[PDB]
Amino acid sequence: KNYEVVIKTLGPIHIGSGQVMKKQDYIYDFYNSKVYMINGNKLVKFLKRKNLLYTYQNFLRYPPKNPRENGLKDYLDAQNVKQSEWEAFVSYSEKLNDLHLMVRDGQNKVYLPGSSIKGAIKTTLVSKYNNEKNKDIYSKIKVSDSKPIDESNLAIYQKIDINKSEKSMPLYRECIDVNTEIKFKLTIEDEIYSINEIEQSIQDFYKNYYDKWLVGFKETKGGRRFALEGGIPDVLNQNILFLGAGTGFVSNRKQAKQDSFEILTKKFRGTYGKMKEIALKGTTNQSRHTSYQQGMCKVSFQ
Amino acid sequence: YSKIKISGTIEVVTGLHIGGGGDSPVVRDLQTKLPIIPGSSIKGKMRNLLAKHFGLKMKQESHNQDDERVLRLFGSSEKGNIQRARLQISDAFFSEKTKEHFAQNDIAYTETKFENTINRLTAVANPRQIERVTRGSEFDFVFIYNVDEESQVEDDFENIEKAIHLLENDYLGGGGTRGNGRIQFKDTNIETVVGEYDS
Amino acid sequence: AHEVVKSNVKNQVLFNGLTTSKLRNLMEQVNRLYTIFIDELEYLKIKFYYEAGREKSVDEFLKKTLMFPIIDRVIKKESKKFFLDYCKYFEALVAYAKYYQK
Amino acid sequence: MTFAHEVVKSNVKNQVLFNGLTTSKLRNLMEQVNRLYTIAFNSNEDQLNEEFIDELEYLKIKFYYEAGREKSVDEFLKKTLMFPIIDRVIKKESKKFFLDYCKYFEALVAYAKYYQK
Amino acid sequence: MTFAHEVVKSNVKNQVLFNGLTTSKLRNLMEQVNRLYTIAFNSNEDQLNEEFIDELEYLKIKFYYEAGREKSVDEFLKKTLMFPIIDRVIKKESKKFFLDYCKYFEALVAYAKYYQK
């Protein structure tokens, strides 16, 4: 039939838009830890009310190559532009060589796509039913896109490679903040995979995920911090799933090893060939010193 | 003999792709270079959804014979019986205030979506593109009803009411399964234009 | 239009490795303006500076087409027809870039 | 002339046509050529107006776009000398030669359609 | 080659004709044939115009296109020796032979029209 689905973002969730911000349209405050996206239109018309557009253009055009002199905050400071005006020209901000933006809609609010949500749901169905003609039932399960996501739930996070020794990935990804509530609407054209069937499919997927992989990252400081803080021993009762990108590639052991070698050989071969002769994605905050793995969120139906 | 016009405005809520011209374009008027909702698509969603909401036998599906209510309300003349359409649906276009509102605010009419593909056992990323009609735009339609029998007008209007009811809760165009097409209706106006009918 | 793109094929690379995926946002800008204002052309100029900054090859592309003088003269002229003529030229450049590739 | 005739039989290999050319892959080109056909037919004089010259320029642009989009169309256009013919047509600026090109291209398409999977 | 005119009766199988040929599907061909029959008939000399030679080329083009669109037309054209006779008429370029082809083709059309579903 037709139902409304509520999503409780347990952790940072990202849906990559393919737009990678360069060294432009931000201010990175080392000293207060907020990055300020800038409205292009308003900023440039400011530049013209201050007739410095040729200066700004040349500053962009041949960067000083001095890393301390290769941002936008320094460009604005060199013209002594007032911080309140520097506050006048901020389109939006979040708490950085590159930054990855989510998809945005015709009014530049983030929404959750229909591709991602059935992406996770299909993955759950395929694993539980062992691909029982699940490609055919794809057409008989329909998910509406999300309602908009207002900014105040948007914040930037670094990619954390959570292994027995933690490592940072050099770039960041913007994410939805913790505990945001997001709704979409659900329609069923194949009654066989009922609402409870779908929920139990997701739950079984999660339990299998736990007893295969989530138990292995133990004895890592960030590991047991998140594993315990998220309450996954109880979460085995909860309907939890990873959405979008940034979740682990996995989302017997020997076959997993061979497959993972093959996939990483196909993926990262152009940069680090070491995969031929041989790791969790999460986020670590400075504010609370608490690590969250990217992707999981709670789903309940109605 | 009389005709009762039905006039109103449809609002798109999620993404919209009709893509009749199909790297993957959308239906558009060449006289305005602007997207449209062709009446054929609306007619098709109507016929399918209403037949499903009524009796849809496997034998009837095989023989393309449709239910008598649906058939009189939309016309078949395929079984050797005379059945002319009693309801005609037209094209639909942008309204003026939508044009203005997008002109002022620096908003486009199209959103191009990358759909990332991750392949099983290989996870090979080949991006794909699809075009969409911006949400928040509203289209203006006219439905023209032909009156042939003075009593069953009310029943046909009621069936059109469930028509719109279903269509609001379903998907129009392409990508209906994946989250594209959810539209709503507002400002419906009924006005007999020819004849002496009280509607 | 054709002359510049065919002659900027050096030894094989185009404008030192130009690929249309780098021109997506500019293409969207040109399409949006084609559907439709001086300030819009201003932010248009700015976005050529933006995308020409994102890659060095793009900066060389916009230089070897003399894009910046062309856009300045467009903004001076303020005539709708001549802006559409610019759109035609830009579309031609994009098409010929698409043809001559890896 | 009808080099189209023997060319189309020269491009039957092992079966693929121009490495898999199909009639659905030339719809846009056929539409554009048809519109230029009717516009030029409406014209009285043989001298081609500068606006029709710009139409020919955009037509050349569209051949190049489609040829960059797909490889089989590229091979078809390359071997059928479409690009040299269009260049010569633009050079000549004569309406009758443009109509002769129209007839040639129509013959090409007709042969390509008659030999299909 | 008159056996090619009375093959039409040898091709009444079981009931469809030429595997479902209808004269209705021959309309474009009939129109073009009538056009150039009139144009040739008004002509004085036996030597045809070179433009008329190009016209005959356009005839072959249209014949191939129609044979591509419909299979019954394809069988009709192929087995009745239409293509070789078209080429031959193009080869001699004499008016009287073109009229001879016209009479053969019209006889074909009328006799086929005698039998239709």
Q: Three-class SS string for E15-33?
A: CCECCCCCHHHHHHHHHHH
Residue type, B158: E
Q: Do A118 and B122 touch (CB under 8 A)?
A: no
Sign, CA torsion B95/B100/B105/B107: positive
C28: contact with B, CB 8 A cutoff: yes
Phi first, then psi: give them for residue B30, nearest 5 degrees: -75, -20
Cross-chain Cβ contact D65/C101 below 8 Å: no
Touching partners of C (3+ C-beta pairs < 8 Å): A, B, D
Residue pair E115/E14 in contact (Cβ under 8 Å)? The answer is no
Q: What is the DSSP string of chain B?
A: -EEEEEEEEEEE-SB----TT------EETTTTEE---HHHHHHHHHHHHHHHS---HHHHHHT---HHHHHHH----SSS----SEEEEEEEE-HHHHHHHHHHT--SEEEEEE----TTT-----EEEEEEPTT-EEEEEEEEEE-SSSTHHHHHHHHHHHHHHHHTS--SS-TTTTB--EEEEEEEEEEEESS---
CA-CA distance, E12 to E21, in Å (whole number)? 11
Number of Cβ within 10 Å of residue A203's Cβ equals 19
Sign of the four-CA dihedral A219, A224, A225, A226: positive
Q: CB–CB of B133/B24 below 8 Å?
A: no
**Would you call A40 and C53 a contact, using CB atoms and an 8 Å cutoff?**
no
Q: What angle separates helix C38-54 from helix A40-49, to the nearest 10 degrees?
A: 110
Contact C35 B103 (CB under 8 A): no
Q: How many CB pairs under 8 A join D and E?
A: 23
Within 8 A of C42 by CB-CB distance, chain B residues are none
* E-only strand ranges, chain A: 2-8, 16-21, 35-38, 90-94, 99-102, 141-143, 154-161, 167-176, 181-188, 240-242, 281-284, 291-293, 296-301
Distance CA A52, CA E110 (A): 85
Which of A145, A184, A189, A259 is the best residue to mutate to test the B interface, defined by the most B CB atoms within 10 Å of its own CB? Answer: A145
- Residues in C closer than 8 angstroms to B106, CB to CB, are 40
CA quadruple A68, A74, A78, A82: dihedral positive or negative? negative
Of B15, B135, B169, the CB nearest to A2: B169
Binding residue ranges of B: 169, 190
Q: Which residue of A has its CA nearest to B176?
A: A142
> What is the sign of the dihedral through the CA atoms of A131, A137, A138 and A142?
negative
CB contact under 8 A, D114 and E68: yes
C99/D58 touch (CB, cutoff 8 Å), yes or no:
no
Structure tokens at C28: 């969207």
Establish whether chain D is in contact with chain E, requiring a minimum of 3 CB pairs below 8 angstroms: yes
* End-to-end C-alpha distance for chain C, whole angstroms: 20
* Pick from A20, A11, A19, A21: nearest CA to A247: A11
Cα distance between residue A243 and residue A246, in whole Å: 9
Determine the Cα–Cα distance for residues A174 and A100; give it in Å rounded to an integer: 6
Instruction: Sort out which chain B residues have CB atoms less than 8 A from A2's CB and list them.
Output: 169
Which residue, among A81, A108, A228, A99, has the nearest Cα to A175 in the 3D structure? A99
Q: C-alpha distances in angstroms, C76 versus C38, C41, C82, C90, D74?
A: 9, 10, 11, 18, 40
Tokens of E110: 């009328």
Count H helices and E strands in chain C, helices first. Answer: 6, 2
Instruction: State how far the alpha carbon of C14 is from the alpha carbons of C1, C7, C59, C72, in Å.
Output: 14, 9, 13, 26
Q: How far apart are CA E35 and CA E29, in angstroms?
A: 10
Chains B, C: CB contacts under 8 A, how many? 12
Nearest residue in chain B measured CA to CA from A148: B14
B103–C36 C-beta distance less than 8 A: yes
Instruction: Please check whether residue C2 is in contact with residue D65, taking contact to mean a CB–CB distance below 8 angstroms.
Output: no
Nearest to A18 among B111, B114, B123 (CB): B114
Q: Which residues contact C69 (CB under 8 A, 6 or more apart)?
A: none
Mutate: best of A57, A65, A70, A99, partner C, most C CBs <10 A: A57
Question: Which chain D residue lies closest to C2 (C-alpha atoms)?
Answer: D61
Q: Cβ(A154)–Cβ(A101) under 8 Å?
A: no
Nearest-CA residue of chain C relative to B109? Answer: C32
Q: Which domain holds residue B185?
A: 1-199
Closest CA to C46 of D59, A39, A286: A39
Q: Percent helix, strand, coil in chain E (nearest 5)? A: 70, 5, 25
- D1 Cβ contact list (under 8 Å, min separation 6): D104, E57
Cβ neighbours of residue D12 under 8 Å, at least 6 residues apart? Answer: D115
Taking a C-beta distance cutoff of 8 angstroms, is the pair A18, B114 a contact? yes
Contact B109, B54 (CB under 8 A): no
Task: Give B10's strand partners.
Answer: B139, B185
Q: How far apart are CA A146 and CA A153, in angstroms?
A: 15
Which residues of B are annotated binding-site positions for Ca(2+)?
Answer: 169, 190
Q: How far is CA D85 from CA A30, A226, D58, D64, in A?
A: 63, 69, 15, 13
Q: Is A23 helix (H, G, I), strand (E, B) or coil?
A: coil
- State both tokens at B31: 């006289």
Paired residues of D1 in beta bridges: none
Q: Are A81 and A36 in contact (CB under 8 A)?
A: no
Q: Do C53 and A24 touch (CB under 8 A)?
A: yes
Q: Is the separation of the CB atoms in E45 and E95 below 8 Å?
A: yes
Say if CB B20 and CB B147 are below 8 A apart. Answer: no
Give the C-alpha separation, E86 to E57, whole Å: 9
C53 and A61 in contact by Cβ < 8 A? yes
Decide: A36 and A90 in contact? Cβ < 8 Å: yes
Q: What are phi and psi of A25, to 5 degrees?
A: 70, 30
Nearest to C50 by CA among C38, C68, C70, C37: C68
Distance CA B77, CA A4 (A): 41
Sign of CA dihedral B126, B131, B134, B135: negative
Number of domains in chain B: 1
CB atoms within 10 A of CB A12: 25
Distance CA A124, CA A143 (A): 15
> Which of E54, E62, E68 has its CB closest to that of D113?
E68
* DSSP bridge pairs for D12: D17
The rounded distance, in Å, linking the Cα atoms of B14 and A29 is 37
Q: How far apart are CA A261 and CA E4, in angstroms?
A: 71
| CA–CA dist B45, B167 (Å, integer) | 7
Write a three-state SS string for chain D. Answer: CCHHHHHHHHCEECCEECCCCCHHHHHHHHHHHHHHHHHHHHCCCCECCHHHHHHHHHHHHHHHHHHHHCHHHHHHHHHCCHHHHHHHHHHHCEHHHHHHHHHHHHHHHHHHHHCCC
* CA-based nearest distance C101→chain D, Å: 9
Separation in Å, CA E27 to CA E37, E60, E85, E101: 15, 15, 20, 18
Residue D68: which of C2, C88, C95 has the nearest Cβ?
A: C95
Chosen from B14, B56, B137 to mutate, greatest number of chain A CBs within 10 A:
B14
* Helix, strand or coil, per DSSP, at residue C79: coil
Distances (CA, A) of D39 to B64, D26, D33, D34: 44, 20, 10, 9
CB contact under 8 A, B109 and C36: no
Which chains would you list as touching D if contact means 3+ CB atom pairs under 8 Å? C, E
Residues of B in contact with C24 (CB under 8 A): 112
What span, in angstroms and rounded, lies between the C-alpha atoms of B34 and E30? 42
| C40 neighbourhood in chain B, CB within 8 Å | 106
Query: D68: how many CB neighbours lie within 10 A of its CB?
Result: 19
Q: Could you give the CA distance from residue B163 to residue B178 in angstroms, rounded to a whole number? A: 22
| Distance, CA of B137 to CA of C35 (rounded, Å) | 16
**Token pair belonging to A241:** 């799933």
- Cβ–Cβ of C95/D69 closer than 8 Å? no
Pick from A209, A157, A207: nearest CA to A178: A157
Q: Give me Rg for the CA atoms of chain C.
A: 13
Quote the tokens at residue C24.
């997506």
Does B108 contact C40 at a Cβ distance shorter than 8 Å?
Answer: no
Touching, C vs D (3+ Cβ pairs under 8 A) = yes
| Resolution of this entry, Å | 3.9
- C-alpha A58, offset from chain centre: 34
User: Would an 8 Å CB–CB cutoff place B115 in contact with chain A?
Assistant: yes
Chain B touching partners, 3 or more CB pairs below 8 A: A, C
Q: How was this structure determined?
A: cryo-EM
